[PDB]
Scaffold this active site. Structure first.
Site, PDB file in Angstrom:
ATOM      1  N   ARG A   1       0.806  -1.211   0.000  1.00 37.04           N
ATOM      2  CA  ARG A   1       0.000   0.000   0.000  1.00 37.04           C
ATOM      3  C   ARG A   1       0.853   1.281   0.000  1.00 37.04           C
ATOM      4  O   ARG A   1       0.836   2.036  -0.974  1.00 37.04           O
ATOM      5  CB  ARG A   1      -0.966  -0.030   1.193  1.00 37.04           C
ATOM      6  CG  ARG A   1      -1.855   1.192   1.332  1.00 37.04           C
ATOM      7  CD  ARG A   1      -1.531   1.889   2.632  1.00 37.04           C
ATOM      8  NE  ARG A   1      -0.941   3.199   2.412  1.00 37.04           N
ATOM      9  CZ  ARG A   1      -0.216   3.867   3.309  1.00 37.04           C
ATOM     10  NH1 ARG A   1       0.042   3.356   4.515  1.00 37.04           N
ATOM     11  NH2 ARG A   1       0.243   5.072   2.994  1.00 37.04           N
TER      12      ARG A   1
ATOM     13  N   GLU B   1      -1.559  10.655  11.551  1.00 33.08           N
ATOM     14  CA  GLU B   1      -0.832  11.264  10.450  1.00 33.08           C
ATOM     15  C   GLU B   1      -0.124  12.543  10.861  1.00 33.08           C
ATOM     16  O   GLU B   1      -0.669  13.341  11.607  1.00 33.08           O
ATOM     17  CB  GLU B   1      -1.783  11.543   9.292  1.00 33.08           C
ATOM     18  CG  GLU B   1      -1.094  11.943   8.012  1.00 33.08           C
ATOM     19  CD  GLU B   1      -2.078  12.292   6.904  1.00 33.08           C
ATOM     20  OE1 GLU B   1      -2.854  13.263   7.065  1.00 33.08           O
ATOM     21  OE2 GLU B   1      -2.079  11.600   5.867  1.00 33.08           O
TER      22      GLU B   1
HETATM   23 ZN   LIG Z   1       3.734   6.473   5.509  1.00 31.87          ZN
END
Ligand SMILES: [Zn+2]
Ligand SMILES: [Zn+2]
Lengths: 306, 306
Positions: free
Chosen positions: A10, A140
């Site tokens: 991914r 994130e």
């Molecule tokens: Zn990453």
């Protein structure tokens, strides 16, 4: 006893000029889970253009056979029902929710209030659990989050411990941390929530990813992210082959990865990905191996030269 | 304010399938000293088959012109008069003596007593000074020396402080140190001899060379060794492009290297050396660079994309 999560299919897929075919993903997934014995694998991102949906379905169909559907994970987003529906359809059983881990990101991309956004998060986690999935959460841009907006980060982790999730991922999204900082940030959260499962996910922009990963192991982390040949978007993710070897020889922690499959895994993704590795690539490079000068890193140790 | 010593032309020359032509060495040397502004350059090994002698002579002839003959260094050995004669002939003014830094090495390769060998060393240093040279000393296999035969190592450094040399090099010859150990070993010697100039010279076998290099900087080192694209014998030497960038952004120490010449230096040695670098190579890779996601490592910063 750390868990290793491969993101090669991914995050590695994001690399320029790289697009794995269904046969390619199936082959690579099988090898990583069965031969390299990587704990889990993050094979794709939700709502990618269908086909990607078909791929996951086939891999899930197979995974069912080998009794290991819980080992496959799918990058997902805070979008209400869309991500969870797609994964429900895919056959996959695990999420890995992408949440904003820095106050700066939250505003420049969503323009919502911590509480505003925390509501969208609780709904997706709720709906996912409702739909039979398990959830892992990415913070994130966390590497910039705990250093610039540590408050926002502390509340997000606080809020997350209230939700029924499996793990929290601490990614150095932009690969800007030094080992010192990686140890600081990880230590900051592991001390507050000593019963949570955090994993580090570094990027190699400064060629510190495996080093950072070692500090993360000291700061308390129970799992680590990485990719074969450091495949990935810029400088790529932490290089799996070097991470494991370093963990095994330069740390008291261990892994379930079978070193002997390391070389084939590398050749494998190199060919299928179409991204060449240099001949001097640590542990896996062609020229790497060549008793007065005995280095613990031997060719047969990684399924090579015999 | 650390000194950076490029070993690309000599240690890098050792890499399989790499042999620089005289024109190639001259070109690369000129670029590193003049454009990248690397403090010094280790261009070759003494008594290599003549021709190599001619190369050094031409480079020295040029170096004289630019008023910087003291910036060129030549790997030499403990062989009495042979090494010093060859360098005297070459035109070069600096040595960099290769001495055994581990009791294990000293015996399995020479079979001499610490005092026995220390005598050969004092003679070569003496004869070199007598011949107008300056001497830097490598403690070959030191990474295994201070961990296995720390006594032998302490006496060697003790003996060396009595000799009239410029610097002592602490190389992780087999690239086996973790940042922790690198800090231990370097700290062990810098504390005892606080007035000596030690430099770290790591190898990238575990992809820890730049990380190790950072610890060495904390433990007291005043200089560091490295090579363009990590060219070198196995996994190569510490990668110059990543080392400098990391030093500048992740440490309070500095360097005189002009970042803007970094990209050309890399393309330069890649082409001439014939060793391809991966597209995801930190700081220098083709795909490396590709404002919400702003990474301190920008393309124009290294003489690219404008
Ligand atoms: Zn990453
Ligand atoms: Zn070396």
């Amino acid at each position: 006893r750390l868990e290793i999560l491969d993101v090669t299919l991914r995050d590695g897929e994001q690399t320029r000029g790289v697009s794995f075919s269904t046969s390619e993903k199936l082959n690579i997934a099988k090898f990583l889970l069965q031969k390299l014995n990587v704990d889990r694998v993050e094979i794709a991102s939700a709502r990618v253009s269908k086909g990607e949906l078909e791929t996951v379905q086939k891999i899930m169909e197979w995974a069912a056979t080998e009794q290991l559907t819980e080992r496959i994970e799918i990058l997902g987003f805070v979008d209400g029902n869309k991500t969870v529906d797609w994964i429900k359809d895919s056959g996959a059983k695990v999420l890995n929710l992408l949440t904003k881990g820095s106050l700066h990101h939250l505003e420049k991309q969503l323009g919502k209030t911590p509480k505003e956004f925390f509501t969208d998060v609780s709904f997706v986690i709720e709906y996912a659990i409702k739909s039979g999935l398990k959830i892992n959460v990415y913070l994130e841009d966390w590497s910039n989050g705990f250093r610039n907006s540590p408050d926002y980060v502390k509340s997000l982790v606080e809020h997350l411990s209230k939700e029924h999730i499996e793990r929290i991922f601490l990614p150095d999204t932009l690969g800007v941390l030094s080992p010192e900082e990686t140890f600081q940030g990880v230590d900051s959260l592991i001390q507050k929530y000593p019963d949570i499962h955090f994993e580090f996910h570094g990027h190699n922009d400064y060629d510190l990813s495996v080093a950072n990963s070692l500090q993360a192991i000291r700061a308390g982390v129970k799992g680590l992210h990485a990719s074969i040949n450091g495949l990935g978007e810029r400088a790529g993710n932490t290089p799996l082959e070097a991470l494991v070897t370093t963990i095994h020889d330069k740390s008291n922690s261990k892994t379930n990865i079978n070193e002997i499959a390391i070389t084939e895994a590398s050749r494998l993704v190199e060919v299928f990905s179409g991204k060449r590795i240099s001949a001097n690539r640590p542990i896996v490079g062609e020229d790497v191996f060549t008793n007065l000068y005995a280095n613990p890193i031997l060719p047969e140790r990684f399924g090579r030269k015999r």
